[PDB]
Amino acid sequence: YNSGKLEEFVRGNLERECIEEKCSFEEAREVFENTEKTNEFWKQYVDGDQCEPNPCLNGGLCKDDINSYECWCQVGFEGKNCELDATCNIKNGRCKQFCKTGADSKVLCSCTTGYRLAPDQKSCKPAVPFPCGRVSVSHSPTTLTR
Amino acid sequence: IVGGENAKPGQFPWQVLLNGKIDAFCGGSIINEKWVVTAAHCIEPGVKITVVAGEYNTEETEPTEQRRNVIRAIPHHSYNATVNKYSHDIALLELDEPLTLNSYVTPICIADKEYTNIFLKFGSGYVSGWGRVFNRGRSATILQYLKVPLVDRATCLRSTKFTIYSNMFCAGFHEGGKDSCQGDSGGPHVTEVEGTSFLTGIISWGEECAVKGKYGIYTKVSRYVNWIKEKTKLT
CATH class of the missing domain: 2.40.10.10 (Trypsin-like serine proteases)
Known part of the structure; x- marks a missing residue:
């Protein structure tokens, strides 16, 4: 609030300043430090979270912004509001490896021998210390040929 | 090249050197630990082939090298009976002992x-x-x-x-x-x-x-x- 008696002279504690009454952004910023992280602490706090009553359906994860907002749809759903179903031809069906329609109309991903389908149902994680087709020297330990 | x-x-990690009668006559690609792949027109009747996984510079012995011996060479069924010798120009080489899969030996x-x-x-x-x-x-x-x-x-x-x-x-x-x-x-x-x-x-x-x-x-x-x-x- 900045109204007691010499409360700037103390290290900011945003537990205190921000959602007592309500803090400024600067108050919030010197206390946060990383100001990526401030920008979004931010867009949720007030101006009517454009993510109001979740627009993205089909389990879509709505992510609000200052002005706009978008939508992360996991799997089997396309379109800015995850209304459209994912069909194997528009952007590989969202699968990182192989996708085929089946038993209905929504996609179904897969991976080549050696890899397994990640929990998102679209990515591929190894399942053998040496999966097929990967240049190993560059990767090891956790680098890239620059 | x-x-x-x-x-x-x-x-x-899949690039294999194929040594046989005279050596370095063909290359191949590791399908997996036991079987490599190469073109049918490399299988010369009666010669013994040794896959040279992990090879790099021929003039020097790279510690990564892993030689094996082909025990079976299965060219594609309908390869060439006596016709265009590059049609199904493909074949599978079955190594006797499995290779040791690593950074330099990957399918x-x-x-x-x-x-x-x-x-x-x-x-x-x-x-x-x-x-x-x-x-x-x-x-x-x-x-x-x-x-x-x-x-x-x-x-x-x-x-x-x-x-x-x-x-x-x-x-x-x-x-x-x-x-x-x-x-x-x-x-x-x-x-x-x-x-x-x-x-x-x-x-x-x-x-x-x-x-x-x-x-x-x-x-x-x-x-x-x-x-x-x-x-x-x-x-």
């Missing part, structure tokens, strides 16, 4: 029929192999690689007098300069799709090397990928 560049050690990915063609028409692919660096000038001592643009049928068919079968495809620079040459057959033709690298055709033949109007012609893996699948099953 004519007009290519030297590859970095470990950059091609290539075999896509299903659909995706293999899909990755082929993406435009470019890597072709690596130990062979003639000059069109009949000298062989590759240190593993060489080159990036070769898939060349459309209409153009391919015209450049060659030879009936360019469905089983194959063209790929190479329109002008004379860069291409695979003798001592590369059976090598790989891979197309990497975001890190992971897949096999899109075995490197087969070509009228001479590095001369304009000509393109290297490779085997359409898409056709036998399934054969490979069933042929290398472990369980």
